[PDB]
Structure formats: C-alpha cells, structure tokens
Amino acid sequence: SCKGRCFELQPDCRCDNLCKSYTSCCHDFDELCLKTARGWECTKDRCGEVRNEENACHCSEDCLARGDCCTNYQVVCKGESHWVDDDCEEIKAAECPAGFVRPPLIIFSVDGFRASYMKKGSKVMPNIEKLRSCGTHSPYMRPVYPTKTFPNLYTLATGLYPESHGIVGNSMYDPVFDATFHLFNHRWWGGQPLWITATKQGVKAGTFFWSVVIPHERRILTILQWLTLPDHERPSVYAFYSEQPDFSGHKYGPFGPEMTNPLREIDKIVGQLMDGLKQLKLHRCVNVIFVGDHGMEDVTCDRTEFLSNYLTNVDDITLVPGTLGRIRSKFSNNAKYDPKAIIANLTCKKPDQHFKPYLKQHLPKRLHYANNRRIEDIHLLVERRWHVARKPCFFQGDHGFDNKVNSMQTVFVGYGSTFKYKTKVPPFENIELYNVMCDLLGLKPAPNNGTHGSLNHLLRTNTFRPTMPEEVTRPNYPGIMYLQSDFDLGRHLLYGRPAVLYRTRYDILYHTDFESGYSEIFLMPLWTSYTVSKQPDHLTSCVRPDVRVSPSFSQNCLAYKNDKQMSYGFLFPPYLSSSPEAKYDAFLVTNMVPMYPAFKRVWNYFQRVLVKKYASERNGVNVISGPIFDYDYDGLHDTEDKIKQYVEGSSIPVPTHYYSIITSCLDFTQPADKCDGPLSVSSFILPHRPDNEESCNSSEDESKWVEELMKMHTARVRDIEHLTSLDFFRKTSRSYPEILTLKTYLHTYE
Numbered sequence: 001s002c003k004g005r006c007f008e009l010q011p012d013c014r015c016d017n018l019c020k021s022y023t024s025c026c027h028d029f030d031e032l033c034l035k036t037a038r039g040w041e042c043t044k045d046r047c048g049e050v051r052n053e054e055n056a057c058h059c060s061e062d063c064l065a066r067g068d069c070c071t072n073y074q075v076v077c078k079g080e081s082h083w084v085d086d087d088c089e090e091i092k093a094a095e096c097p098a099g100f101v102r103p104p105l106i107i108f109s110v111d112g113f114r115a116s117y118m119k120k121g122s123k124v125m126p127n128i129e130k131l132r133s134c135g136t137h138s139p140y141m142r143p144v145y146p147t148k149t150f151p152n153l154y155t156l157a158t159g160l161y162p163e164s165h166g167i168v169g170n171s172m173y174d175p176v177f178d179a180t181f182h183l184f185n186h187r188w189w190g191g192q193p194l195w196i197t198a199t200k201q202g203v204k205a206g207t208f209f210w211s212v213v214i215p216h217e218r219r220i221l222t223i224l225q226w227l228t229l230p231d232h233e234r235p236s237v238y239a240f241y242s243e244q245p246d247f248s249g250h251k252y253g254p255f256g257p258e259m260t261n262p263l264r265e266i267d268k269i270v271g272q273l274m275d276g277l278k279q280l281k282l283h284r285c286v287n288v289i290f291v292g293d294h295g296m297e298d299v300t301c302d303r304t305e306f307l308s309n310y311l312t313n314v315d316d317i318t319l320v321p322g323t324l325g326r327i328r329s330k331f332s333n334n335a336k337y338d339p340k341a342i343i344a345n346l347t348c349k350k351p352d353q354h355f356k357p358y359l360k361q362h363l364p365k366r367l368h369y370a371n372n373r374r375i376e377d378i379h380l381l382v383e384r385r386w387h388v389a390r391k392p393c394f395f396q397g398d399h400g401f402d403n404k405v406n407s408m409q410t411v412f413v414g415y416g417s418t419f420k421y422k423t424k425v426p427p428f429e430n431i432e433l434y435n436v437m438c439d440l441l442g443l444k445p446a447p448n449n450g451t452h453g454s455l456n457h458l459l460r461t462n463t464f465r466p467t468m469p470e471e472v473t474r475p476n477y478p479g480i481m482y483l484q485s486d487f488d489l490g491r492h493l494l495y496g497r498p499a500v501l502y503r504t505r506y507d508i509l510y511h512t513d514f515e516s517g518y519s520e521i522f523l524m525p526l527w528t529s530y531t532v533s534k535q536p537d538h539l540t541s542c543v544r545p546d547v548r549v550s551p552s553f554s555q556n557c558l559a560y561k562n563d564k565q566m567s568y569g570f571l572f573p574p575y576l577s578s579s580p581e582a583k584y585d586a587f588l589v590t591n592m593v594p595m596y597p598a599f600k601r602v603w604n605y606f607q608r609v610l611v612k613k614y615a616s617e618r619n620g621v622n623v624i625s626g627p628i629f630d631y632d633y634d635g636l637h638d639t640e641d642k643i644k645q646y647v648e649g650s651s652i653p654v655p656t657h658y659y660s661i662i663t664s665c666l667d668f669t670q671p672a673d674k675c676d677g678p679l680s681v682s683s684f685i686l687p688h689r690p691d692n693e694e695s696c697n698s699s700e701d702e703s704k705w706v707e708e709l710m711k712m713h714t715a716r717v718r719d720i721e722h723l724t725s726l727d728f729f730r731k732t733s734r735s736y737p738e739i740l741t742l743k744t745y746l747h748t749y750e
C-alpha cells in the first residue's frame with residue numbers, strides 16, 4: 001500500500017508518479033493518490049472545512065500547513081488576490097523562506113506552442129501574458145532540426161544537437177546492427193541531461209516526466225506539495241509537461257478556432273501554478289521558465305508529394321515520411337540500389353516541386369544534421385505546409401520542417417528572481433537553455449553545443465564570467481624572402497585578427513586592400529579580411545608568386561590546368577581593388593583557392609555584385625572569407641587525416657565549403673570602419689559542389705538564383721569557428737558576453 005508514501009521521489013508496490021506508466025502501482029494508488037473529488041477549485045461554502053481525505057484538494061484551516069491546499073484557497077477565503085490580478089512588482093532579490101540554499105527552478109514545457117500564439121492569444125492567456133510581460137522574454141525561440149518533440153525536448157535538457165545526443169527521430173535504423181529502434185530511458189542516450197547534472201552536484205531534482213493519465217492540475221499540486229517538504233528532502237529543480245497545444249494543433253491546425261480553448265486551458269494551469277506559489281510565499285522566490293519544443297504548420301492530406309511519381313522502383317526503398325524524408329535501401333544485397341540515381345531522379349523534376357533532396361553532408365550546416373550513423377544518407381527537406389509519402393482526414397497541422405521556418409518558431413519566457421525584470425531579449429536557440437538552467441542552479445554545465453555567456457543578458461544575477469579562448473599557434477610574419485626566379489608556377493582588420501585555435505603554421509600577410517592568414521599546411525588562406533566603404537581588366541589567367549612565402553608551400557597553375565574538373569578563384573576579389581597598382585596584390589598565388597566552375601558562378605556573383613550592394617545598404621561592410629574542410633561532416637575543422645580530395649596531382653586540399661562573415665554598425669549612420677556601438681553581422685557557409693543541382697534555376701542569370709542559395713546556407717559566426725578552429729571578434733569595444741550573443745546570431749530571411 002501507498003499509505004502516505006504517495007508521489008515519492010524514490011521489488012515493492014510502487015508510489016512514484018511514473019509508476020502508472022510501468023503498471024507497477026499499488027492497488028490503492030487510484031484511491032489515495034489520484035483523488036478527483038469536488039474538483040480543483042474552492043467555493044464560499046467549502047471554506048470552514050472537514051479536512052476530508054475523500055477530496056482532491058482541501059479548503060480547511062489545516063490546509064496551508066500540511067501543504068495540500070486548493071490553489072485558489074487564499075483568493076477565495078482569506079481575501080487575498082489572484083496573482084494575475086496583481087501589478088508587476090520587481091524582484092530585486094530571492095525571497096525564500098529560511099533554509100532554502102537557492103531559488104528553485106520550475107520548467108514549464110509545452111508541446112507545439114508556436115510563437116505566434118503569444119500575440120494572437122494575449123486576450124485568452126492572461127496568466128502567461130503576465131509572465132511574459134513582467135519577466136524576461138524573446139519574440140521567439142528557435143528549436144533544432146528536426147522540429148519534432150523528442151529531439152527538441154532532449155536538446156532542451158542536454159544542450160546538444162540531435163546528431164550528438166542521438167535522438168535523431170522516433171524510429172531509427174542502425175546499420176551496425178541492421179536493426180530499427182522505436183522510442184523512454186534517458187540513460188542510453190548521449191549527453192548529460194539537467195536532472196543528472198544537478199544530481200551529480202548535490203542538488204536534488206524532481207521528475208521531468210509524468211505518467212500521462214495524471215492530470216495537469218494534480219501535477220501542479222504535486223509540485224507545490226513537494227515544495228513544502230523539508231530541506232533534506234525538497235528538490236531544487238522541477239518540471240511540468242503538456243501535450244497541448246500540439247495535440248489539438250495536429251487535429252485542427254494552428255489557426256483553427258478550436259485552438260482557443262486549449263491555450264486558455266494551459267493558461268489556467270499556469271494560473272494555478274502562480275496562485276499556488278503565492279499562497280506558499282514562494283511567488284517571489286522561484287524562477288519559472290515557460291518554454292516550447294517547437295511550433296505548428298498547416299498541413300493537410302491533399303498537400304502530399306509521392307515518391308512513386310519520381311522513382312521507378314519505390315518498393316526497393318524505405319521512407320520515413322512526413323515533414324522530412326529519410327531514405328534507405330529496404331533490401332540488404334540489392335545491387336540495383338543507387339543513391340546517386342535516386343537523388344538525380346528526385347532533383348528539379350517539376351517547376352513547383354515541394355521538396356528538395358540532399359545527401360546529409362550537403363544539407364545546410366546550420367541544421368547540424370549529419371554526424372550520426374542513424375541519419376540516413378538521403379534526406380528530403382520538405383517545403384513548409386507539405387508532406388512526403390512513398391506512394392498512395394486525420395490531421396490539419398504538423399511540424400518537423402526546417403527550423404528557420406516561422407511556423408516552427410516557439411516561445412520562451414523567464415520569470416523569477418534571477419531573471420531580468422520587464423526585459424525583452426532577442427531570439428536565441430534552445431540549445432542555449434541548458435547552460436542557463438545550470439546557471440540558475442549553480443551547476444557547472446556538462447560539455448554541450450550551447451555557448452556559455454551568450455545568454456547573460458537574460459539574467460539579473462548568476463551570470464558566469466566567460467573567457468576568450470587562447471591562441472594555440474602564434475603567427476609567422478615573413479618579409480620579402482624569395483626571388484621571383486625561385487618559383488615554378490605557370491582598417492581591413494576592424495575586430496581583431498582572428499586567433500588560430502589549433503597547431504599549424506601560418507603566415508599573416510598584409511596588402512593595401514586586405515589582410516590574410518595563410519596556412520603553409522593547407523596551401524591557402526585560413527581567412528581573408530577586407531573592408532569595403534559604402535562609396536575588371538584582361539588579366540584573368542595571370543597569377544604572381546608571393547615572395548613572402550616559399551614555393552614549397554605555394555600552389556601552382558600546373559595543377560589547375562591538368563584538372564579538367566577544378567578551377568581557381570580569389571578570396572579577396574580583384575574586382576574590388578582600390579587602384580591599378582593594388583590590383584596586382586589580388587592576383588598573388590597566396591590569394592587563390594580551389595573552386596569548381598559551378599561554384600565560381602555563385603562566388604563571382606557574390607564578390608562582383610552583392611558585396612557592393614551590401615556596402616551601400618549597411619554603410620560599409622567588413623568581409624572575412626575563408627575555406628572550410630569538413631569531409632567527415634561532424635561540423636568541425638578536419639585534420640589532414642580527413643581530407644579526401646586534392647587538386648590534380650598536388651597537395652592542395654579542396655575545401656568542402658566557403659564561409660563569409662559580413663559585419664557592419666548597428667547604427668547604419670556610422671560607417672563600418674568607424675563604429676562606437678553594437679555590431680551588425682550576417683554570415684554564411686556555402687557548400688563547394690561540382691554542380692548547381694541544389695538550385696533549380698541555375699540555368700538562368702545569377703540575379704534569379706544565387707542570392708536564394710545564400711539565404712539558405714545562412715550561418716552563425718559560432719558555426720564557422722567550430723568548422724575552421726578560429727576565433728573572431730577578439731579586439732572590439734564591446735563586452736565579451738555581448739560578442740558571444742553576436743556570434744550566436746543567425747540572420748534568417750523571413
């Protein structure tokens with residue numbers, strides 16, 4: 001029996017909340033623990049009360065002490081007020097009763113709560129509105145790809161991309177075992193979640209999981225109940241979860257009028273939470289995070305592309321369907337199965353095609369969706385509002401699309417003593433929360449993909465002091481060291497010189513129009529920096545040796561002549577040179593990089609047309625460009641070990657991508673090279689591909705397609721730091737936490 005052991009935190013008859021899922025509860029759990037009687041609200045008559053065990057909650061004078069009161073008791077029978085009726089009072093300091101070592105954290109998570117419901121629900125969710133308004137909040141929070149529940153909830157809790165924590169979807173095929181696994185035990189998965197991190201550091205955690213038949217009102221009383229327990233038992237961190245509004249969203253669509261009740265209902269539970277805390281004097285002591293795993297889009301049966309309309313033998317493939325596609329051979333010894341053919345077959349075959357196929361390594365890097373062996377090589381990015389099935393109602397809403405999509409954005413509100421008061425912060429990525437939650441609990445966070453510091457502007461106190469990483473390889477500064485005859489060939493640095501964070505050998509090179517860091521190992525620049533202010537020739541096939549760099553560690557024009565696939569281009573573009581004299585610097589062999597003919601069309605468009613437009617538009621730009629090597633698609637700078645391809649019969653490694661970081665003043669009335677304030681930045685990581693299969697209008701003028709591809713491969717600065725092992729923005733006039741925020745920014749074009 002459960003006697004009074006009920007909802008306990010720890011062979012026998014079981015009393016914990018998760019027992020009902022494992023069907024291991026004692027026969028009397030439904031009698032003692034899950035009482036439903038009289039409802040979840042007091043009334044005038046209920047007050048002055050027999051502390052009747054039969055009830056769900058009590059309105060007796062006993063009530064307050066035992067810690068099992070109905071959440072609106074004070075409001076109804078001691079004259080006090082609903083917390084939503086009070087005016088925002090700032091909380092300059094945690095107001096906890098004696099013997100609390102720290103402010104409790106309550107994570108209030110909701111499935112499928114799209115960011116728009118905040119504007120178009122103000123009227124119907126007043127308690128949530130009061131959290132938003134009095135607390136700290138962002139316009140939206142960005143989930144991770146894929147925008148599905150389990151992958152997002154576990155990232156939330158761990159700080160890791162799905163590729164790394166391992167929950168890449170609900171069914172996953174492991175080719176090591178040739179078996180499929182259907183999704184819960186935290187422990188077999190990657191990363192350290194929050195409830196563990198806290199436990200290992202002597203901070204007691206409550207459950208982050210509930211048995212679905214336990215109704216929401218009971219879960220709240222349970223948390224308030226636990227909060228009255230004594231110091232040696234009481235947990236410091238708790239978690240509520242709601243399947244709504246995701247559940248109704250699938251059924252009715254995010255804009256269905258049927259959505260209105262479910263949000264009101266979620267708001268009621270958030271009401272009980274606050275009314276309950278308040279009547280335990282804990283409403284200015286606990287920190288609450290109201291947070292969402294992802295959003296919801298309109299998607300119906302009739303918007304469904306079918307693979308059988310593209311592929312000869314569709315019974316030879318296995319497809320995970322829906323708002324993303326994952327394709328895999330169904331049969332093990334099938335020599336008829338050809339990934340290159342499949343992708344070709346699925347590539348721009350209709351003008352209005354509602355998905356695009358990709359091998360995972362060609363997916364835009366911002367998705368971080370490749371480095372896991374249960375991610376099938378062939379992936380389909382599905383257009384928003386659409387589905388993908390194998391071959392030929394329930395639903396009008398779904399999610400799982402590209403996480404830059406708006407319908408997929410989600411919410412974050414931070415209320416409490418440690419959060420700023422009435423503050424609006426910019427949108428961030430949910431991988432950043434794990435680090436913040438550790439901060440609120442005094443924990444050293446486990447290694448994750450967050451960037452610790454980048455969210456210090458959300459917090460009143462408890463900010464941790466991030467430190468710039470150390471240069472690992474100091475630069476060389478060659479002077480004029482060689483003769484033209486030794487060779488057998490054929491202001492611009494506004495934010496600090498970036499710092500090389502791995503062991504290598506590089507020369508820093510200066511020119512009038514640009515500054516560069518040249519790797520004597522990779523035979524090209526690691527980075528090329530140049531400012532262009534707001535305000536040609538027939539030398540195409542000439543290159544000059546750089547006299548500051550030995551011919552051993554320079555590229556040559558023989559390799560590029562004898563490579564019928566590969567060509568070369570410049571990181572600093574000759575077109576932007578400041579004078580006929582200076583133009584010769586842009587043609588130094590130290591400025592060449594390997595570039596497929598197809599990539600040049602993108603790259604020339606960019607250097608010739610978009611940079612000067614960007615400069616006009618933003619009042620100057622600083623531009624840092626370099627190559628990236630990521631052949632193992634793990635999002636990190638490759639070692640020489642990992643390089644698969646080279647320019648014909650040479651040591652010149654071919655980059656898998658090319659980055660650029662484009663930087664200006666937030667105050668566009670000050671030019672780029674004379675800021676006094678915050679910075680503005682947008683970056684991208686363009687894949688380096690022999691063809692333009694990815695862009696459906698590549699046969700047209702670059703004005704009609706290059707800029708669309710670029711928007712698609714937008715990237716955070718931080719992404720490029722991981723992929724290049726550099727560190728940018730080391731010598732600005734801004735604080736290091738502000739700069740971390742700048743670096744986590746991704747410029748979405750929506």
Ligand SMILES: O=C(O)CCN1C(=O)[C@@H]2Cc3c(n(Cc4ccc(F)cc4)c4ccccc34)CN2C1=O
Pocket residue numbers: 172173174179180181185188189374
């Ligand atoms: O070291 C190695 O490579 C193999 C060793 N090994 C393990 O001992 C655990 C066992 C286990 C794992 N998972 C997660 C998983 C999910 C989908 C899959 F297709 C494969 C695994 C589980 C989930 C439920 C119950 C047990 C497990 C992952 N493990 C290993 O890979």
Ligand SMILES: O=C(O)CCN1C(=O)[C@@H]2Cc3c(n(Cc4ccc(F)cc4)c4ccccc34)CN2C1=O
Pocket residue numbers: 107109149150151153154156157184208209210211212239240241242243291
């Ligand atoms: O109560 C219900 O309506 C259904 C029971 N249920 C769930 O379906 C989800 C599944 C899930 C939960 N968590 C923990 C969590 C909670 C809040 C966060 F901000 C982050 C993580 C997960 C972690 C990884 C993967 C799956 C999950 C919580 N759930 C339930 O109790």
Ligand SMILES: *[C@@H]1O[C@H](CO)[C@@H](O[C@@H]2O[C@H](CO)[C@@H](O)[C@H](O)[C@H]2NC(C)=O)[C@H](O)[C@H]1NC(C)=O
Pocket residue numbers: 160161164165190191368447448449634635636722
């Ligand atoms: C995301 O975070 C994880 C954890 O910090 C990084 O993964 C670790 O990588 C190291 C070195 O490659 C391995 O030895 C560890 O086993 C990895 N840990 C886990 C839990 O997977 C990962 O590199 C980060 N990803 C990016 C793109 O920055």
Ligand SMILES: [Ca+2]
Pocket residue numbers: 629630631632633634635636637638639642
């Ligand atoms: Ca790599």
Ligand code: NA
Pocket residue numbers: 560561562563564565566567
């Ligand atoms: Na060539």
Ligand code: NA
Pocket residue numbers: 692693694695696697698699
């Ligand atoms: Na094309």
Ligand SMILES: [Zn+2]
Pocket residue numbers: 110111112148149150246293294
């Ligand atoms: Zn969800």
Ligand SMILES: [Zn+2]
Pocket residue numbers: 112149246247250399
């Ligand atoms: Zn869903």
